[PDB]
Design a protein around this ligand. Structure first.
Ligand SMILES: CCCCCCCCCCCCCCCCCC(=O)OC[C@H](COP(=O)([O-])OCC(O)COP(=O)([O-])OC[C@@H](COC(=O)CCCCCCCCCCCCCCCCC)OC(=O)CCCCCCCCCCCCCCCCC)OC(=O)CCCCCCCCCCCCCCCCC
Ligand SMILES: CCCCCCCCCCCCCCCCCC(=O)OC[C@H](COP(=O)([O-])OCC(O)COP(=O)([O-])OC[C@@H](COC(=O)CCCCCCCCCCCCCCCCC)OC(=O)CCCCCCCCCCCCCCCCC)OC(=O)CCCCCCCCCCCCCCCCC
Ligand SMILES: CCCCCCCCCCCCCCCCCC(=O)OC[C@H](COP(=O)([O-])OCC(O)COP(=O)([O-])OC[C@@H](COC(=O)CCCCCCCCCCCCCCCCC)OC(=O)CCCCCCCCCCCCCCCCC)OC(=O)CCCCCCCCCCCCCCCCC
Ligand SMILES: CCCCCCCCCCCCCCCCCC(=O)OC[C@H](COP(=O)([O-])OCC(O)COP(=O)([O-])OC[C@@H](COC(=O)CCCCCCCCCCCCCCCCC)OC(=O)CCCCCCCCCCCCCCCCC)OC(=O)CCCCCCCCCCCCCCCCC
Ligand SMILES: CCCCCCCCCCCCCCCCCC(=O)OC[C@H](COP(=O)([O-])OCC[N+](C)(C)C)OC(=O)CCCCCCCCCCCCCCCCC
Ligand SMILES: CCCCCCCCCCCCCCCCCC(=O)OC[C@H](COP(=O)([O-])OCC[N+](C)(C)C)OC(=O)CCCCCCCCCCCCCCCCC
Ligand SMILES: COC1=C(OC)C(=O)C(C/C=C(\C)CC/C=C(\C)CC/C=C(\C)CC/C=C(\C)CC/C=C(\C)CC/C=C(/C)CC/C=C(\C)CCC=C(C)C)=C(C)C1=O
Ligand SMILES: Nc1ncnc2c1ncn2[C@@H]1O[C@H](COP(=O)(O)OP(=O)(O)OP(=O)(O)O)[C@@H](O)[C@H]1O
Ligand SMILES: [Mg+2]
Lengths: 41, 110, 161, 106, 67, 49, 70, 60, 256, 108, 99, 231
């Protein structure tokens, strides 16, 4: 709760391994890219 | 005596469950105010399940508004001054066609 | 407590960012991500009224910019005369003339009046739904009166003896 | 009124404050911001004015079976009660009064 | 009963003797509407309320009548 | 006038003259199910829903 | 935050240390200059062109689902 | 019990090969005149109706 | 025998009659029991909808023609119509009128094949109305308690006995027809209330009715027999006897 | 032949009754196990399912469970006539007798 | 059609194609309707015959099918009237006096 | 609240609240056998058995992906019946529908089962999501009970039991502890607990008229430049 990431009070290592809602969308798109290997191939 | 002791106990649990439904709804309704002040996709999140039923209307191509609503109150408000005032028939699909055709001894199938 | 199931079925082709089925709700979410949040101004005055002199300069700069660039502006003014006369005389009645001549054509007003009434019904949603529950709660409270009578029978049977 | 001012000062007349603070921020909020599509812990508001139905007794058994006394109630009702429905509705005291006259004779 | 008593009473709902001669607004306000005013929605309510009084809130009479 | 007369004849009148709907039915089980279903919910209606 | 932003961080890791730890708090003008070019999470870093595609792709796909389902 | 819910008011026609068998072809149509000769009788004997005969003579 | 039959296990006698509103066919055939998620194939392969329409609509439709191919092998369909189509095909380039007269006998040949290869469908609502009037049948059977254990109905091959039916010994009729248009079958019934079963054997023939050229009833039950079997009682009910029914009416002898 | 039971794959077994008393005891256990059945002990051979809180759709679920346990393939034409406990018992007898004489399952 | 002014070198390209589309598919509506009637399609139009001569009825059946299509194709004269009337107004406005 | 004032709101050309047989020009008319040569009609008497088979298909094909969850199967049955009981209980006279209400609903349900057979129906995807969120919470409680810890639900139940004892020990004049009083005791605890959690703002306006969003930051300006990450 009080350990939630703050864009101001943030470490460099924490920002590099943030993995927020933006990355969760991309990881879903990557699952589609991988599953389309045989169709595109 | 144990027959009605357990009968009335289960009867009370049924209506206590209904009482908790109406009580909990009025409790969650305290945080919801002015539906006109919420975005479209957030209003659907308060009323979870409406997005699912909206996808059912889309995937089955029931894109006639209010066709599956028993009282299409929105359809009546839209046609208060319409010519040939009518609402869509219940569960009318835009693709179904019940047209018939007959040949009689007279012309035009009469 | 009995151990529940570990998980339900997980659909391999449905996600939150790429939902399998379609509706206006998901499109509405991606639309507001695009236009972004409501650009709320924190100031005491609106941006246009505070910079009227400055916006007037840049307003006339681009007018002059287009005017200095367009050397054949008179050819464009003359080429626009015929369609300007034609389309305005043709659509006058359907836009404005109907408001004081042969027919009103109130179709678009009927759509405003119905939507204005729905705006009020949504504003009074909490009131209307609460009145509907007052009748259901009355029915529920009436059924719960039979259990209150039964819980006193043991005391009645004991005091009667 | 229909004369509110110039076009540039049109967005000025919208704000209405609940406090006495000056100067006043002019912007009138249109909607509530919804940045993250978070699944709400709140229950759905569709469950509003639904009449009594099968889901009431089905959920009553599920919550009663969480207790020792409730497990006895459910088992006796589903086995030893001559009713053609689980949606029990008390509209008379026939079954109640006749159960007391058959019990208080002792 | 008192509500219907005054609706039927001729003295309560009766034009003045000179009402026929007076200038009459022959519109409910739907011909020229204020679109960009902040009280735009309140204007529409008064138009709807004016149309309802003319037909005793039976708007089917308005739908069949002449506009 | 010619706009209305076009669609009122090419589609509305043309199909009224050569197509129709039957009034005889082949199955009527919805009517008898609704009657039995209403008797099943007699107690709930008695509570004024 | 995306992988391209995280790749910039590993390359600019020593530059971020000089700006955020040394320059951003020294004094005076060097402090203001270091706090202005600070390195971290992008404020207003959303890409509208990416979002324009996601919206238009979804809206055009719902149309494809209707036109192709005949 | 599907026959319990079958409506006998559909017995007004006896449809077979897109034709109502309860059609008074002896009183109406090309098959009404009884003074038809051997060729006309053998022609109606094949088709068994005038609608099918007229439809084929359309293309012939 | 039902001509139109897919790999679907349920409702065999209704498969050709039921007109589903499906856009395409279901992923799997109707399950006979609850299966596992891995029992079926998620995301069916590409061109699956085209494959299903071939194996569920095209293929059983061709097996219907092949099963009843003996009803279309007459001299009219085999020799006259193709011979007529070949005579005008030699002049198909001269004018358009030869193209029409060369294709019409082909379309006429298709329609006779389409009509003759369909399953023999009698008016079953007439039959149930007929048996529910008999007091000896309604004693053990009622519509609300009857169920079908087996059903069979197929045309009879070739010409019948030329003493019981001298009608079919007509050279003009034999030129157009290679079969009789008569059908025979049975109905295995059971009653869940009384526990009784019966076999309803019947023979049908087309009869003329009320008019000169049109057939009256293409499937007229001229012999309708029921062998009712109960807990310990065996009864035989004769609704329509052929020795008495064939003395009043004769078959129709379809042409074309 | 295997099904999931509370998240675990379990091998399913089929029953062969072939006896009147085994049929009545199976059907009673079948109807009592259905979660919509009321008055489970008042259920006898002559019990109408409507008197125990069951409708036409509950008879389909009951027949669907018969195909699971006995391996039958019951057509949709037979289901709407199964409205009593006696009807299930007589139908099971009719299926076993039909297979004992005709050598095949009834038409589906 | 204003939003398609820059999509091609002809402002009325979509309108010129749509009038042909509207003509072809409307012309096909009666043709598919007769196909739905079947071989009895002539009885659906004219009804029962009157004479025993198939050649005589053929001429009445040919006119019955001719009238079937004339009821549709003749309505396009109404479209010509709207275009002629629309052009006459455009010719008067475009040549109106301005000096 | 607010009620519709137009008394003719539910009037149609076919009658009051008529959404089963709307009035149109091409009205259904009878056919006479003696005068009818041929006919093209798609109506039949097969909707009853198709309605039965569709229920069996939808039930059995959805249970394929329930993993034997008995409670989910019984819950799904209650939901499936509510979909098939629409024509039997609706205000609309489904027996008076224009061209056969039975055929219309059967064809409508077949479109649903086609999606169900492919495991793509939105009611299915909604069921898997709801059940996964439910089992995740039940597994959290099970892990806390195996560890001897008290669940958050038991803490409120125990806290609410001692509140009733405290209220009924001070209320000696009256001895009728109504369900109304029992409810407002729990709701007073529920509001305090809900306000204690760090939840996203649900209501539009906070205690003031202002919105509770991150965008509702107006003057005065008192925030400096954003600071970077720390090493
Ligand atoms: C001032 C103006 C300046 C103008 C110039 C710049 C304009 C801006 C352009 C920006 C838009 C285009 C973006 C291009 C890349 C930019 C980097 C980027 O993506 O943004 C950072 C982006 C972060 O996204 P975000 O915008 O910040 O937020 C995401 C949201 O939260 C939600 O997450 P999300 O994943 O849902 O969001 C996806 C996101 C980004 O998704 C992407 O990953 C971008 C993918 C773009 C295409 C890449 C594949 C190109 C295939 C090349 C094939 C090889 C060619 C050579 C062959 C060798 C032989 C010589 O948005 C897009 O998809 C944008 C795509 C725009 C449409 C592109 C297609 C147009 C089709 C119409 C035809 C037009 C004709 C010209 C097209 C030219 C194409 C070359 O980073 C990532 O996504 C990381 C991806 C991690 C996995 C990558 C694995 C590789 C996947 C490659 C695709 C494989 C598909 C199968 C192969 C197909 C070909 C055979
Ligand atoms: C190398 C040197 C060259 C490079 C130099 C670089 C510097 C360039 C300078 C550019 C300056 C950029 C910074 C400011 C950008 C926005 C300017 C502005 O007025 O925003 C305040 C204004 C209100 O701000 P606010 O005070 O905070 O009030 C907030 C409430 O929402 C207010 O809503 P409300 O309804 O409650 O209150 C009234 C509202 C009433 O205003 C409105 O709500 C809407 C007004 C109409 C919007 C425009 C309709 C255009 C329809 C599209 C057709 C033309 C598109 C142009 C491109 C087409 C292809 C060429 O606005 C007002 O407060 C008074 C009106 C102030 C004038 C705004 C309208 C002027 C026309 C701007 C459109 C410019 C493009 C078309 C011009 C002719 C073609 C060149 O916002 C807008 O009007 C948005 C309109 C779209 C903005 C982008 C338009 C392009 C850039 C505009 C530059 C304007 C001057 C140059 C053109 C003038 C020609 C006559
Ligand atoms: C010329 C150049 C030619 C070049 C080549 C052209 C191409 C030819 C090859 C292709 C031929 C066409 C193929 C058509 C077949 C396609 C299938 C079909 O459509 O069905 C057949 C089709 C069916 O006709 P239908 O209308 O359905 O029959 C009416 C009823 O259905 C039938 O009803 P019903 O059966 O119950 O009874 C019918 C009849 C009862 O009929 C009978 O019972 C008689 C039966 C007799 C049978 C005899 C058997 C003999 C057997 C052989 C001999 C025995 C063995 C000998 C062995 C010897 C061995 C060596 O009852 C009546 O009372 C008839 C009404 C009174 C007669 C009306 C006649 C109108 C004629 C008007 C003109 C008169 C002018 C006279 C001048 C004469 C001198 C030039 O037959 C026709 O198409 C006939 C042609 C109709 C043309 C109409 C327009 C032309 C009018 C005549 C021309 C006027 C002259 C103009 C110029 C004047 C100066 C010369
Ligand atoms: C420049 C272009 C100009 C043209 C523009 C349009 C282009 C054309 C496209 C139009 C559509 C054509 C495609 C049709 C597809 C048909 C498919 C099919 O065959 O299904 C069968 C189907 C019939 O089945 P059904 O009606 O559903 O039910 C039949 C019953 O079940 C049956 O009940 P039943 O068993 O009681 O009936 C008995 C039998 C009775 O039949 C008879 O009448 C018998 C006739 C006599 C036979 C000969 C007897 C010989 C006697 C010899 C005796 C020997 C024995 C001697 C003694 C023995 C010796 C020992 O009836 C039949 O079975 C025959 C029905 C089928 C006849 C074939 C009809 C189609 C022929 C088309 C020919 C030309 C096609 C060219 C297309 C090329 C491709 C582009 O055929 C049709 O439905 C025909 C529909 C036609 C409607 C479309 C008409 C559109 C109007 C066009 C003219 C427009 C003019 C104005 C234009 C204005 C500008 C646009
Ligand atoms: C805006 C850009 C996109 C444009 C898309 C088109 C938008 C059209 C908006 C909907 C208007 C549709 C009008 C339909 C008729 C409504 C009036 C009515 O029902 O009549 C009732 C009328 C009026 O009765 P009434 O009671 O409702 O009104 C009474 C009128 N007052 C109040 C004045 C007394 O009654 C009739 O029955 C007459 C029927 C005449 C039929 C006329 C319409 C025929 C054409 C319709 C079919 C066209 C299909 C074309 C398809 C082409 C495909 C290739
Ligand atoms: C001269 C060389 C050949 C010339 C070209 C011939 C091409 C023939 C194949 C393409 C056309 C096929 C017909 C398409 C239109 C009808 C669609 C359809 O099939 O519906 C079936 C329909 C299906 O019935 P239905 O469509 O009415 O609906 C069924 C009812 N419900 C929905 C309730 C289930 O059935 C039929 O019409 C009967 C069978 C039609 C047979 C079609 C032709 C088959 C030809 C087989 C040739 C075999 C020998 C050669 C090959 C040898 C092996 C390689
Ligand atoms: C298949 O079904 C369909 C859809 O899906 C349902 C659709 O959405 C749609 C709608 C289509 C859209 C919504 C897309 C619209 C896009 C349009 C119109 C054009 C987009 C143009 C841009 C985004 C501009 C980008 C600018 C440029 C490309 C010019 C500069 C060059 C650049 C940036 C690339 C340099 C060139 C290279 C060859 C290097 C490539 C670089 C990379 C791959 C780097 C990526 C790095 C990582 C780490 C991923 C259709 C029509 C459809 O048919
Ligand atoms: N009285 C009728 N009115 C209008 N159309 C009809 C009528 N009877 C049949 N039709 C149409 O003709 C088709 C064939 O009718 P048919 O009697 O052969 O069906 P059926 O299911 O075999 O009846 P049955 O169960 O008695 O055998 C029907 O599917 C229907 O579309
Ligand atoms: Mg039949």
């Amino acid at each position: 709760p009080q350990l939630w990431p703050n864009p101001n009070k943030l470490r460099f290592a924490d920002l590099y391994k943030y993995q927020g809602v933006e990355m969760k969308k991309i990881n879903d798109s990557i699952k589609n890219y991988k599953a389309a290997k045989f169709y595109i191939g | 005596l144990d027959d009605i002791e357990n009968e009335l106990s289960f009867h009370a649990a049924i209506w206590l469950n209904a009482y908790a439904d109406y009580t909990m709804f009025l409790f969650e309704l305290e945080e919801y105010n002015d539906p006109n002040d919420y975005l479209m996709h957030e209003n659907f999140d308060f009323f979870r399940g409406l997005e699912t039923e909206l996808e059912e209307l889309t995937e089955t191509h029931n894109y006639i508004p209010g066709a599956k609503d028993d009282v299409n109150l929105r359809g009546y408000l839209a046609t208060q001054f319409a010519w040939g005032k009518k609402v869509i028939s219940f569960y009318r699909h835009p693709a179904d066609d019940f047209k018939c055709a007959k040949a009689t001894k007279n012309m035009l199938g009469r | 407590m009995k151990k529940p199931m570990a998980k339900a079925y997980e659909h391999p082709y449905n996600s939150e960012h790429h939902p399998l089925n379609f509706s206006a709700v998901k499109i509405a979410e991606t639309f507001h991500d695009f236009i972004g949040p409501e650009q709320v101004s924190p100031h005491y005055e609106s941006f246009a009224m505070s910079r009227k002199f400055l916006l007037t300069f840049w307003g006339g700069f681009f007018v002059l910019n287009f005017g200095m660039a367009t050397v054949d502006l008179n050819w464009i003014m003359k080429s626009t005369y015929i369609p300007w006369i034609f389309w305005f005389q043709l659509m006058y009645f359907y836009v404005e003339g109907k408001n004081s001549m042969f027919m009103p054509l109130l179709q678009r007003f009927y759509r405003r009046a119905a939507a204005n009434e729905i705006f009020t019904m949504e504003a009074f949603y909490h009131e209307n739904i609460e009145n509907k529950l007052r009748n259901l709660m009355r029915i529920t409270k009436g059924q719960l009166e039979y259990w209150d009578i039964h819980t006193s029978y043991g005391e009645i049977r004991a005091d009667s003896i | 009124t229909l004369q509110w001012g110039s076009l540039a000062e049109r967005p000025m007349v919208d704000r209405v404050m609940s406090t006495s603070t000056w100067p006043v921020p002019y912007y009138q909020r249109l909607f509530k911001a919804y940045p993250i599509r978070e699944k709400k812990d709140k229950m759905s508001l569709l469950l509003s004015d639904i009449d009594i139905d099968d889901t009431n007794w089905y959920q009553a058994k599920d919550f009663l079976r969480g207790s020792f006394r409730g497990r006895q109630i459910v088992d006796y009702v589903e086995n030893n009660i001559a009713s053609n429905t689980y949606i029990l509705i008390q509209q008379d005291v026939a079954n109640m009064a006749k159960a007391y006259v058959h019990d208080i004779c002792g | 009963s008192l509500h219907e008593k005054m609706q039927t009473d001729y003295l309560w709902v009766k034009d003045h003797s000179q009402a026929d001669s007076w200038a009459k607004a022959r519109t409910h306000g739907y011909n020229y509407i204020a679109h960009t005013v902040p009280n735009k929605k309140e204007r529409y309510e008064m138009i709807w309320r004016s149309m309802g009084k003319s037909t005793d809130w039976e708007l089917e009479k308005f739908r069949l009548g002449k506009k | 006038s010619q706009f209305v007369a076009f669609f009122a004849i090419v589609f509305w009148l043309f199909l009224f003259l050569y197509t129709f709907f039957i009034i005889e039915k082949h199955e009527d089980f919805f009517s008898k199910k609704r009657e039995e279903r209403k008797k099943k919910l007699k107690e709930l209606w008695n509570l004024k829903n | 935050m995306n992988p391209i932003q995280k790749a910039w961080l590993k390359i600019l890791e020593p530059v971020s240390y000089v700006i955020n730890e040394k320059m951003a708090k020294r004094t005076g003008i060097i402090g203001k200059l270091g706090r202005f070019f600070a390195i971290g999470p992008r404020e207003y870093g959303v890409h509208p062109i990416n979002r324009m595609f996601i919206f238009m792709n979804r809206k055009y796909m719902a149309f494809q689902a209707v036109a192709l389902h005949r | 019990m599907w026959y319990k819910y079958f409506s006998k008011q559909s017995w007004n026609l006896r449809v077979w090969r897109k034709a109502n068998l309860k059609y008074n072809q002896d009183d109406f149509g090309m098959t009404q005149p009884k003074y038809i000769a051997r060729f006309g009788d053998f022609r109606f004997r094949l088709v068994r109706t005038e609608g099918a005969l007229r439809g084929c003579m359309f293309f012939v | 025998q039902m001509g139109f039959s897919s790999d679907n296990p349920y409702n065999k006698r209704w498969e050709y009659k039921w007109k589903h509103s499906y856009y395409t066919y279901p992923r799997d055939y109707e399950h006979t029991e609850v299966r596992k998620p891995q029992d079926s194939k998620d995301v069916p392969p590409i061109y699956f909808a085209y494959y299903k329409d071939f194996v569920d609509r095209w293929l059983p439709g061709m097996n219907m023609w092949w099963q009843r191919r003996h009803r279309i092998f007459d001299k009219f369909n085999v020799y006259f119509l193709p011979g007529m189509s070949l005579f005008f095909y030699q002049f198909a380039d001269l004018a358009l009128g030869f193209k029409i007269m060369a294709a019409f006998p082909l379309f006429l040949a298709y329609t006779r094949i389409r009509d003759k290869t369909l399953d023999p469908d009698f008016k079953e609502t007439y039959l149930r109305d007929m048996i529910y009037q008999n007091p000896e049948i309604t004693k053990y059977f009622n519509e609300e308690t009857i169920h079908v254990l087996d059903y069979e109905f197929e045309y009879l091959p070739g010409y019948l006995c030329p003493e019981k039916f001298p009608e079919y010994q007509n050279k003009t009729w034999q030129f157009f027809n290679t079969d009789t248009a008569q059908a025979e079958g049975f109905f295995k019934f059971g009653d869940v209330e009384s526990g009784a079963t019966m076999t309803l054997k019947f023979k049908t023939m087309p009869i003329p009715g009320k008019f000169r050229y049109q057939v009256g009833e293409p499937f007229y039950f001229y012999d309708l027999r029921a062998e009712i079997k109960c807990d310990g009682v065996y009864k035989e009910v004769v609704l329509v006897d052929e020795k008495e029914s064939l003395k009043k009416i004769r078959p129709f002898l379809f042409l074309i | 032949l295997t099904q999931y039971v509370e998240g675990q794959i379990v091998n399913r077994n089929q029953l062969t009754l072939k006896k009147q008393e085994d049929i009545e005891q199976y059907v009673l256990k079948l109807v009592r196990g259905y979660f919509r059945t009321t008055n489970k002990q008042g259920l006898n051979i002559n019990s109408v399912l409507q008197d125990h809180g069951l409708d036409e759709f509950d008879s389909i679920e009951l027949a669907m469970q018969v195909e699971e346990d006995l391996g039958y393939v019951i057509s949709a034409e037979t289901i709407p006539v199964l409205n009593k406990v006696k009807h299930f018992v007589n139908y099971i007898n009719h299926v076993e007798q039909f297979k004992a004489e005709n050598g095949k399952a009834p038409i589906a | 059609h204003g939003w398609t002014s820059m999509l091609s070198h002809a402002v009325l390209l979509l309108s010129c194609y749509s009038i042909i589309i509207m003509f072809l598919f409307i012309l096909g509506m009666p043709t598919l309707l007769l196909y739905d009637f079947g071989i009895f399609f002539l009885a659906y139009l004219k009804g029962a015959g009157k004479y025993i001569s198939s050649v005589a009825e053929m001429m009445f059946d040919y006119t019955a099918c001719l009238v079937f299509y004339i009821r549709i194709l003749a309505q396009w004269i109404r479209v010509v009237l709207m275009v002629v009337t629309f052009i006459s107004l455009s010719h008067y406005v475009s040549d109106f006096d301005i000096t | 609240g607010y009620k519709i004032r137009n008394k003719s709101i539910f009037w149609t050309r076919a009658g009051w609240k008529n959404n089963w047989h709307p009035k149109n020009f091409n009205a259904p008319r009878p056919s006479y056998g003696e005068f009818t040569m041929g006919i093209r009609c798609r109506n039949d008497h097969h909707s009853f058995l198709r309605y039965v088979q569709t229920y069996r298909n939808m039930s059995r094909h959805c249970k394929q992906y329930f993993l034997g969850d008995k409670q989910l199967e019984e819950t799904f049955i209650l939901g499936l019946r509510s979909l098939f009981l629409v024509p039997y209980d609706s205000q609309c006279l489904t027996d008076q529908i224009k061209h056969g209400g039975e055929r219309r609903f059967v064809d409508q349900l077949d479109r649903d089962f086609e999606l169900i057979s492919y495991n793509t129906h939105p009611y299915q995807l909604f069921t898997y999501t709801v059940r996964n969120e439910h089992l995740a919470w039940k597994n959290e409680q099970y892990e806390k009970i195996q560890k001897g810890e008290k669940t958050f639900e038991q803490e409120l139940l125990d806290y609410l039991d001692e509140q009733v004892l405290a209220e009924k020990a001070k209320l000696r004049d009256g001895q009728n502890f109504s369900i109304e009083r029992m409810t407002e005791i729990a709701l007073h605890v529920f509001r305090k607990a809900r306000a204690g959690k760090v939840r996203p703002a649900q209501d539009v306006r906070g205690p003031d008229g202002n919105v509770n969003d991150f965008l509702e930051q107006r003057r005065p300006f008192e925030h400096p430049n954003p600071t970077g990450v720390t090493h």
